[PDB]
């Protein structure tokens, strides 16, 4: 019973006849998926898991860095006294599922408790050879094309009373978000206003389960780099930055129409992988369209002593994409075999 560092390998069903860059990377760097994957239930162990100290995330992070570093073609790169210009053709970009697999002598433990809060003992444990397929969606504020909670919404935090620790919300029902750059940089995303608010009611109640009978407010981002103040994501190689203010402007107490978010495709970005900026070429022409599933949220709670109203306010944060991967790797740990 121990978290030991093995070098994982990846597996995928990448298609050689696809131009999408994830396929090329996983084709060269991964092997095909097990056609008949075997899962083994264990002796009713209470093994401790700690999604916040899970070495898989660093390894997965490196993979996406490698993928991004050999697939994406920024026109200019600014990194510590260096600025590198290269050809920057448009790519075909649509994430594919990647499985992480333990090498010989190791295994992956899987937590199957439906209400696992992210840290602590798991009572329904199983062993697997590889993870489920995880789409490596790089985004902020909203997690797209991820995994759903199977029964109820789950709130996960390394320590929820420490306001400096990020909070990961995992939904149990997808909310579809439709973003289009209509057939050059003005674009928009639609989300059901009613479905988002009905979702907010349950999120607020779940958050309220620790902060008992307090009024819960969702409010817009307080500041930071463009990467974290807007909902950012990659759709077809273009970097969308959507004003999410209209999503996080409501209050919920012990008690259809679309929201269209104004977005812009930016050529100049601050890099998530490393401190620096990158410049990409202007958007393609033609209709740009991506439909994603909102599956979770990243929230930060304002700290400090209480002024008047019982109100706790949460604003989206994020930026360190290790937490994006964590939102998917929380149920796994790598172990050496007896």
């Amino acid at each position: 019973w121990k978290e030991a560092t093995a070098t994982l390998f990846c597996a995928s069903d990448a298609k050689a006849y696809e131009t999408e860059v994830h396929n090329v990377w996983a084709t060269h760097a991964c092997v095909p998926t097990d056609p008949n994957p075997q899962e083994v239930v264990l002796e009713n162990v209470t093994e401790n898991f700690n999604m916040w100290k899970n070495n898989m995330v660093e390894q997965m992070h490196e993979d996406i860095i490698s993928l991004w570093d050999q697939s994406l073609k920024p026109c200019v790169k600014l990194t510590g006294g260096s600025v590198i210009t290269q050809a920057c053709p448009k790519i075909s970009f649509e994430p594919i599922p990647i499985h992480y697999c333990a090498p010989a002598g190791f295994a992956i433990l899987k937590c199957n408790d439906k209400k696992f809060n992210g840290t602590g003992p798991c009572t329904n444990v199983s062993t697997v050879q590889c993870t489920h397929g995880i789409r490596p969606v790089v985004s902020t504020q909203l997690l797209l094309n991820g995994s759903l909670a199977e029964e109820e919404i789950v709130i996960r935090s390394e320590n929820i009373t420490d306001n400096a620790k990020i909070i990961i919300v995992q939904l149990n029902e997808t909310v579809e978000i439709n973003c289009t750059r209509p057939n050059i940089r003005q674009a928009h995303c639609n989300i059901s206003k009613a479905k988002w608010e009905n979702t907010l009611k349950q999120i607020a109640r779940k958050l309220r389960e620790h902060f008992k009978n307090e009024t819960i407010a969702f409010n817009q981002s307080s500041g930071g780099d463009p990467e974290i103040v807007m909902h950012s994501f990659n759709c077809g190689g273009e970097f969308f930055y959507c004003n999410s203010t209209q999503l996080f402007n409501s209050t919920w107490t012990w008690n259809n129409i679309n929201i269209t978010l104004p977005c812009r495709i930016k050529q100049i970005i601050n890099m998530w992988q490393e401190v620096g900026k990158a410049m990409y070429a202007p958007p393609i022409k033609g209709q740009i369209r991506c439909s994603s599933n909102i599956t979770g949220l990243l929230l930060t709670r304002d700290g400090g002593s209480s002024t008047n109203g019982t109100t706790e306010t949460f604003r989206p944060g994020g930026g360190d994409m290790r937490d994006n991967w964590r939102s998917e790797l929380y149920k796994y740990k790598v172990v050496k075999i007896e």
Partner: antibody
Amino acid sequence: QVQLVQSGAEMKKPGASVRVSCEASGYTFTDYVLHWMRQAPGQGIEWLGWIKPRYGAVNYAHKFQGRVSMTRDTSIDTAYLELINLRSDDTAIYYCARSFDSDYEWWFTYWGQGTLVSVSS
Amino acid sequence: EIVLTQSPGTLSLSPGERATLSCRASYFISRDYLAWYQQRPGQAPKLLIYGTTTRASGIPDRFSGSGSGTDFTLTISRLEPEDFAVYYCQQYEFFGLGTKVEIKR
């Protein structure tokens, strides 16, 4: 050796704005949360908020929303606090500080030397 | 919200005596994190004890920490002259209002 070196004392009139600096050395700047605190004459220590310098995420105390702006320059590893709408009861010694530990980021081993801010007409 | 009540407001003891400083929380705040700091006139505060009981580097042996997870105690086994200063307890963004340790004459 971690060291935080702040700018010198400032005099300001009510309603003005003040900028305080905090120079970091001896460590990877983006690896630790930076907090801002102040100590008014004869009063306790007040936490204004923190900034995580990697992306500039911030958290501002309830009582200072609309009054504070926190930023940083990662190319010279320096953080900056801007305060607007100064009034008399903003007079205080200001400190930036960080924890030695990365799991619990509130064990304040390293403090700036302090900046006196005097606000008067 | 954590409310930390420190006592006494002023502590009057003779040098060489043992000081017991109190910090009372308004609800259960665990034993894992509460920390104590020292501040001398004209200086920033200095971290003395972290994680209820662990002395940092350079902290004298006469400082010892204890606590139930709600109420905590800082013991100075034998006060030396330079230990007379202001002492705060803290966890996260929350601070006590301080205890001054002074010389009885």
